[PDB]
Amino acid sequence: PIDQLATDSNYLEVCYILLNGEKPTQEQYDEFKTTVTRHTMIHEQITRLFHAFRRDSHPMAVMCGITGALAAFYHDSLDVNNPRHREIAAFRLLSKMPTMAAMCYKYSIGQPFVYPRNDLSYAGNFLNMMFSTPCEPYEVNP
Amino acid sequence: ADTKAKLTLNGDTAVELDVLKGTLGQDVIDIRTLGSKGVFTFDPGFTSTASCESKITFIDGDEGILLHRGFPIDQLATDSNYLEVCYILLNGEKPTQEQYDEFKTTVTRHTMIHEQITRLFHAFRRDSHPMAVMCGITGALAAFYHDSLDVNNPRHREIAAFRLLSKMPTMAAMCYKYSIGQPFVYPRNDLSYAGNFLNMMFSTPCEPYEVNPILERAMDRILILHADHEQNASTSTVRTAGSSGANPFACIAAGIASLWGPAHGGANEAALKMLEEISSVKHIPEFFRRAKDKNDSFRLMGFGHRVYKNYDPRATVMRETCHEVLKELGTKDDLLEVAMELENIALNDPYFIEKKLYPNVDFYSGIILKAMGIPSSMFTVIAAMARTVGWIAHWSEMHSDGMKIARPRQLYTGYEKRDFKSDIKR
Amino acid sequence: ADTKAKLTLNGDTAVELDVLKGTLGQDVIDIRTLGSKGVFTFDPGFTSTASCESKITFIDGDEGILLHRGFPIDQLATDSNYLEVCYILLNGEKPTQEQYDEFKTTVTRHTMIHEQITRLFHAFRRDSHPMAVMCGITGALAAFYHDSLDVNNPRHREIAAFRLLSKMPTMAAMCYKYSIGQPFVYPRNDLSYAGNFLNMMFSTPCEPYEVNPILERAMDRILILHADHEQNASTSTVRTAGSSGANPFACIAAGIASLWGPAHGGANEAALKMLEEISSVKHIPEFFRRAKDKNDSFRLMGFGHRVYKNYDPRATVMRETCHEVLKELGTKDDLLEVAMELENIALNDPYFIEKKLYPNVDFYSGIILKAMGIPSSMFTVIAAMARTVGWIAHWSEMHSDGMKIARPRQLYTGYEKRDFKSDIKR
Numbered sequence A: 001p002i003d004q005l006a007t008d009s010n011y012l013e014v015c016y017i018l019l020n021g022e023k024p025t026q027e028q029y030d031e032f033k034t035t036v037t038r039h040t041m042i043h044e045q046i047t048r049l050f051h052a053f054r055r056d057s058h059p060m061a062v063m064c065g066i067t068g069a070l071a072a073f074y075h076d077s078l079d080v081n082n083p084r085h086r087e088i089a090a091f092r093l094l095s096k097m098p099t100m101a102a103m104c105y106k107y108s109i110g111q112p113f114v115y116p117r118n119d120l121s122y123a124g125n126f127l128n129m130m131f132s133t134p135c136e137p138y139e140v141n142p
Numbered sequence B, C: 001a002d003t004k005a006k007l008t009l010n011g012d013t014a015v016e017l018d019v020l021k022g023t024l025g026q027d028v029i030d031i032r033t034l035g036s037k038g039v040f041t042f043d044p045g046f047t048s049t050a051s052c053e054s055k056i057t058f059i060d061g062d063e064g065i066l067l068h069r070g071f072p073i074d075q076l077a078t079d080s081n082y083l084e085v086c087y088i089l090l091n092g093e094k095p096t097q098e099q100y101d102e103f104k105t106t107v108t109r110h111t112m113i114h115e116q117i118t119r120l121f122h123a124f125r126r127d128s129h130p131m132a133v134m135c136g137i138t139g140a141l142a143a144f145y146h147d148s149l150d151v152n153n154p155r156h157r158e159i160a161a162f163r164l165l166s167k168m169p170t171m172a173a174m175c176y177k178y179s180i181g182q183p184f185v186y187p188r189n190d191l192s193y194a195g196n197f198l199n200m201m202f203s204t205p206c207e208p209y210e211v212n213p214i215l216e217r218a219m220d221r222i223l224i225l226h227a228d229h230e231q232n233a234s235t236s237t238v239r240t241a242g243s244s245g246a247n248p249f250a251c252i253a254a255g256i257a258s259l260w261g262p263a264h265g266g267a268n269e270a271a272l273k274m275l276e277e278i279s280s281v282k283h284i285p286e287f288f289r290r291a292k293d294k295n296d297s298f299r300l301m302g303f304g305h306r307v308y309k310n311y312d313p314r315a316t317v318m319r320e321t322c323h324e325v326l327k328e329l330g331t332k333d334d335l336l337e338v339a340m341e342l343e344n345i346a347l348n349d350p351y352f353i354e355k356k357l358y359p360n361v362d363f364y365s366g367i368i369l370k371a372m373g374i375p376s377s378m379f380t381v382i383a384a385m386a387r388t389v390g391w392i393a394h395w396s397e398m399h400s401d402g403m404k405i406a407r408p409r410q411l412y413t414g415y416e417k418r419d420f421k422s423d424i425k426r
């Protein structure tokens, strides 16, 4: 039930459950969480795509733009039939999406982009990438 | 207090002119009606004309007085700090701790500029003089800050004030990092206004930067001492341009340009000619170059000033400050032993004694900055950078009074109505 | 020949003053040395203070008289071109065939802007205002043209003056192209000043652009009618700025910012508020919007002007030229028939006759610019572009007079000296 999940679980475990069909063991959770974390920073060339959009472009439009541009850069995980390719294509999107979302925001307001931080959680990190600046230490309210 | 009531002008009909008085300084003959009566004065330079009513700065050139809201520049530079002076100039009264907290937090909260504006620096040549880049940047702000251009909306003025006040030192330290191929530094909320400017000016991503408290206060002092200076040329340009609806970002840009006009406007080698003759006549370690240089003397070199007669009041606390800076940096300033020689020259050379080329606040500021490492190209960027609040206050006051549009008269002396007949045919 | 002799100011004794005479208009009272006695005059706005002696443009508001070097505006606006009028404003006399051709040539051969300047446009926002960006590039030019800043050098001043008469259209057109998103177009030395402009504004690689002779002529006259307009605020901003010794470019950038001061200085909804009320009360095809809009009437919409009493002497030709244009664009301008109703209202509606809201040059210049497919935003830009030759002449005439640094006085009514005691700790 969606209730229990939202109250007892956390996005990444649900991410694990949806994709795998079963709940994760601590060891499998560690493994899965470490894979999403390990690939949050996107290619710097892709980062150069944001800078080709107008500062006045609606964030969603920029998002569809960015996401529709990934295939050019991730040309080695396009074989929808290679099982290994699907695993990569899953993890990438799962890891880089909040990263591209917080960049669509920083862009539309003239604030510098924030790199992912491995020490931060999936949500706390998205919060950090969304709001923090190079000017002051950002406090992630629990 | 003899005739602080009335007087008379005699053109053809005895026109009654009311004499107006201040709380300090001289009296003024209200002639704002003469024009209508078909009577115009002729004062190119407004040397005998009072452009407005002001309550910000008061200067007594003969007696060496400089007051900001009634407070002597000395006390402010010794007791206060730039931001409090910023508060006082703009508000007219000193800040309560709570109001200070409030004001300081607002300047701090808006130091980082738009990243798109940051992309303007990258369109300038790496070889562009910093000041030129500054006027360029500041003249480009209106495009980005299009929501604070209504010079008539009170809320717009508050934003336009705070922005400039917060982002100026940020754009100044970027004009420096740029001209030397070093990465820009983001503002840091934990740092002070001066210490932060020092950090943005010098630090790199390679090592932790140490903000010397002595330099921190010194820099701060340079700022308080360059805040405002009554109705000078730049402050006049700002007001004139401003009385014509010009947005705050444009007024400050002309104020900046108006400020370094005497610099480039001298000659590619005016105060630079002899700076080239230091390789042929270097036989004498002083009278070569800038001891023999001034054939056409300059106060830009830090000597003399048209406003004060015997001395410059701002130079008093600047000289003292300059003493610690040199005594702090030690074995990197022993070569900069010419400041003394130069000071001695100004104090004793009959020509200098004669024409009163005394050292001014800039002489002592130049040394401080020179000892600090900041190049001469940056001196003026830092003068204007500090001077911004003085321009804003004067700009603000002008808009509260009545923003009387600049519409002076002229004495026409060209041809009379003549007919035009196409002399050419092309 | 009345008071052409002298006058005397009396405070408590007699002070005799001269009374210089101009070849046209009102004479003035020489008060230059008044300050060398402490006696000052009060006059915010200088509307009763002749700021300088000029010979470029003569005006008589009530008579509706406009003159440029004596030649009536209506004579130039018809039997000359922008460059020939520029030559006159800049040189005092109508050019000779050999003079005009050489002046013309140098203007066309310097129409391109350095590739690095072009790059700066790219860091501005697309949504920015062509005028806000126009200011940005203008005050940014000094960062490149460091070879012509020294204002006391006649060589520099001329080069700089030519760099601006050549580069303004190029610059302006690019503001437009970048705002809409079409590629920048290089100047064609085979086309006239105006044609070359309409090409840079409307040309696209997809096909060759062909300038309509009537439209080309129409733009040249818009330029002619905006060439100069005496001592106004935006020209007096150039003069004030230039007195300090500020470079030409930054001075020309000040005027642009001061020329559209009333446009943005209005408010996000000054003459734009009711423009939003054209969707709810559109039941009436005119009195909705800009027939009801002006609560705070605007001369920026083409109705009224402080200079003239009953009409604009520049609006004469502009109106005739307006018809020819509309009488050429036919089936695309029939909908812009509000131009005649608005004009009809301006001539008969009480509200207008009361405040003397007559259609000025900008009224008709706008109908033509709109008729030609030009966006509103690019109207003061074009006006600032045309007015630059004037600002060039004024700035130049001020650089011969004696370059008198604007150093006005002030009636100081602030606080008398008071000790400073800060009660803060931050």
Ligand SMILES: NC(=O)C1=CN([C@@H]2O[C@H](COP(=O)(O)OP(=O)(O)OC[C@H]3O[C@@H](n4cnc5c(N)ncnc54)[C@H](O)[C@@H]3O)[C@@H](O)[C@H]2O)C=CC1
Pocket (backbone or CB within 6 Å): A035, A037, A038, A039, A040, A041, A042, A043, A044, A087, A088, A089, A091, A092, A116, A118
């Ligand atoms: N489950 C798995 O084994 C997976 C393996 N991969 C592999 O890992 C590689 C990663 O590719 P992308 O991340 O898309 O590369 P990318 O070049 O497109 O984007 C980011 C680059 O930064 C590095 N990076 C990303 N986030 C980082 C972080 N948080 N800390 C440190 N470095 C970080 C990446 O290793 C990569 O070189 C793929 O080429 C694929 O071979 C990708 C997904 C899952």
Ligand SMILES: NC(=O)C1=CN([C@@H]2O[C@H](COP(=O)(O)OP(=O)(O)OC[C@H]3O[C@@H](n4cnc5c(N)ncnc54)[C@H](O)[C@@H]3O)[C@@H](O)[C@H]2O)C=CC1
Pocket (backbone or CB within 6 Å): A109, A110, A111, A133, A135, A136, B106, B108, B109, B110, B111, B112, B113, B114, B115, B158, B159, B160, B162, B163, B187, B189
């Ligand atoms: N007294 C007040 O309430 C003021 C309010 N403002 C408001 O604040 C907004 C700020 O605009 P700008 O700073 O000019 O925006 P901007 O986009 O032009 O430039 C900097 C951006 O970075 C952020 N920023 C700047 N310095 C920062 C710092 N030290 N720490 C964290 N973030 C920082 C700003 O919030 C802003 O979004 C304005 O749009 C205005 O509504 C501006 C001035 C005074």
Ligand SMILES: NC(=O)C1=CN([C@@H]2O[C@H](COP(=O)(O)OP(=O)(O)OC[C@H]3O[C@@H](n4cnc5c(N)ncnc54)[C@H](O)[C@@H]3O)[C@@H](O)[C@H]2O)C=CC1
Pocket (backbone or CB within 6 Å): C106, C108, C109, C110, C111, C112, C113, C114, C144, C147, C158, C159, C160, C162, C163, C187, C189
């Ligand atoms: N009467 C004269 O001799 C004048 C000479 N100049 C000189 O122009 C030189 C650079 O002038 P700017 O155009 O402002 O240089 P710039 O630094 O702005 O560069 C523009 C470049 O494009 C060239 N250019 C511009 N329009 C051109 C055209 N229509 N055909 C061919 N080349 C064209 C220029 O010669 C120059 O190399 C300076 O050294 C200055 O002395 C400027 C005005 C008058």
